[PDB]
Specification:
Order of helices and strands of chain B: HHHHHHHHHHHH
Protein name (chain B): Pre-mRNA-splicing factor SYF1
Distance between the termini of chain B: 74 Å
Function (chain B): Involved in pre-mRNA splicing as component of the spliceosome. Involved in transcription-coupled repair (TCR), transcription and pre-mRNA splicing.
Structural class of chain B: mainly alpha
Oligomer: part of a larger assembly
Family (chain B): Belongs to the crooked-neck family.
Order of helices and strands of chain A: HHHHHHHHHHHHHHHHHH
Strand content of chain B: under 5%
Subcellular location (chain B): Nucleus
Number of strands of chain B: 0
Largest interface: A-B, 13 and 13 residues
Radius of gyration of chain B: 26 Å
HAT repeats (chain B): 1-31, 62-86
Structural class of chain A: mainly alpha
């Protein structure tokens, strides 16, 4: 109130060397007053009051103190930079969830030297194999060289080798070899997209053995009808509806189709697919009016034959 | 400038003057003025300063602390809603620190995902019964599951013909096991009809 800039700072500093050893609540309030009085550049005690209150937050348990370590470290980061990172490393380690919490913080600190920080965080046979393929070959390779080492790992590692090798049949084969150890069909469909690729895939599927065979059958059919029917016979036996859809896309479609339908009906009231596949076969026939009328004749023929069959 | 500050030695006037320095873009100096205003007018007029002061300074940890100092009504909720998305649960705890307020928190917690919301109601229980019915029943429908069903019993017993339909539904839900409890439920609701009819 006496308009003293410097004498108030003398009083405040001369008080806060003994009076907080108990603790520092009124010290923080007088810090807020000193930042206020300076207002009515000068936000130094703004940081000191926040940092003291951050450390003042008691560490009870392990995750509670490690949660506070995330708060004050971010406060220290935005505003001994190495010793605060080291005391943060011991707080996170000295607390299951800290492996995902620190890694983040740790990485950030390291980024803000690189070889030592990575060895501490990384501290098993497949992990060494993943490192030797995308370590030396800064961000992404080294910025997922330690984050990756900790469900889509075989898929991401196969995409990492395909990107590293191309900048290739050496890295793609490493993904194809690790696909076999359902999963191998993903690496097979990707390597072929980049016809050996079309085939290798086929061969693999064959050797292995409803969705997996549908992908291999549709790929060999789209590339340019003999092997499409062969894959249907060694897979379809959803699966019954798939065999009907395969015959639609791939002369003797009505006869064989109807035979199959009747057989299925006999091998189990449940003749809704015989009238539906016959109505689509009639409507799909080339002729409009003549095409639509032919579809009605084909659909009604299945309905009449179905309604007269017990 | 000094000619103007002479006025500061001695609210509309206040916001106006801060707007002057803002026009001169002294920025931080201007925020100081809002410091000098609020030490004066206390929790009434100070709010009238403070809402614009927040919207502005955030626009420019410090502001977080400023709300912290500030906190000692809806303004707190807007402000807290801001802080969580620019810890969230912490904010929800702050709002927790009235029915509409309970309704909000639950909404933001649902925004953080479903699991908390069932949790929120338990806090909620302690016209409010209509709200606990509004959320507890929903949680029961969503449904740990044994604790949830027993909770459905605890809530149905916690405290109205539609509610009778609710307890009857909870009894009916059982695969031939919610009958006895169901008839007991309709019996209790009938007892409520008795206490209601008994009223003058």
């Amino acid at each position: 109130n006496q308009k003293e800039f410097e004498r108030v700072r003398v009083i405040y500093k001369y008080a806060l060397d003994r009076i907080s050893k108990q603790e520092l609540f009124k010290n923080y309030t007088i810090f807020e007053k000193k930042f206020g009085d300076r207002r009515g550049k000068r936000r130094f005690q703004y940081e000191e009051e926040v940092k003291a209150n951050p450390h003042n937050y008691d560490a009870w348990f392990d995750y509670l103190r490690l949660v506070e370590s995330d708060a004050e470290a971010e406060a220290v980061r935005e505003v001994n930079v190495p010793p605060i990172q080291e005391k943060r490393h011991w707080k996170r380690y000295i607390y299951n969830y800290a492996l995902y919490e620190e890694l983040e913080a740790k990485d950030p600190e390291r980024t803000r030297q690189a070889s030592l920080e990575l060895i501490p965080h990384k501290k098993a046979k497949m992990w060494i194999l993943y490192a030797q393929f995308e370590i030396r070959q800064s961000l992404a390779r080294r910025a997922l060289g330690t984050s990756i080492g900790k469900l889509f790992k075989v898929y991401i590692e196969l995409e990492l080798q395909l990107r590293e090798f191309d900048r290739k049949f050496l890295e793609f084969g490493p993904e194809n070899c690790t696909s076999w150890i359902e999963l191998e069909t993903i690496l097979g469909d990707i390597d072929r997209a980049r016809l050996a690729i079309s085939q290798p895939r086929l061969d693999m599927p064959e050797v292995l053995w409803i969705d997996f065979e549908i992908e291999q059958e549709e790929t060999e059919r789209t590339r340019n009808y003999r092997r499409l029917l062969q894959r249907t016979q060694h897979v379809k036996v959803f699966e019954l509806s798939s065999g009907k859809e395969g015959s639609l896309t791939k002369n003797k479609t009505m006869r064989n189709c109807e035979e199959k339908e009747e057989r299925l009906m006999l091998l189990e009231s449940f003749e809704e697919e015989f009238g539906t596949a016959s109505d689509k076969e009639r409507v799909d026939k080339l002729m409009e009016k003549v095409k639509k009328r032919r579809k009605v004749q084909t659909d009604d023929g299945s309905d009449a034959g179905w309604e007269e069959y017990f | 400038r000094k000619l103007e500050r002479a006025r500061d030695l001695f609210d509309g006037c206040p916001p106006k003057y801060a707007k002057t320095l803002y026009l001169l873009y002294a920025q931080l100096e201007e925020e100081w003025g809002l410091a000098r205003h609020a030490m004066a007018v206390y929790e009434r007029a100070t709010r009238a300063v403070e809402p614009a002061q927040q919207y502005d300074m955030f626009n420019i940890i410090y502001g977080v602390t400023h709300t912290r100092g500030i906190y000692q009504h809806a303004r707190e909720m807007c402000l807290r809603f801001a802080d969580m998305e620019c810890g969230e649960i912490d904010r929800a705890r702050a709002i927790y620190s009235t029915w509409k307020d309970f309704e909000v928190r639950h909404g933001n917690e649902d925004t953080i995902k479903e699991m908390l919301r069932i949790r929120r109601s338990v806090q909620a229980t302690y016209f409010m019964a209509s709200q606990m019915l509004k959320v507890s029943g929903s949680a029961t429908g969503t449904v740990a599951p044994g604790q949830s069903g027993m909770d459905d019993m605890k809530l149905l017993e916690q405290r109205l013909a539609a509610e009778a339909e609710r307890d009857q539904p909870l009894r009916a839900q059982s695969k031939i096991l919610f009958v006895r409890s169901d008839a007991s439920r309709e019996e209790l609701a009938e007892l409520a009809q008795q206490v209601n009819p008994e009223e003058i």
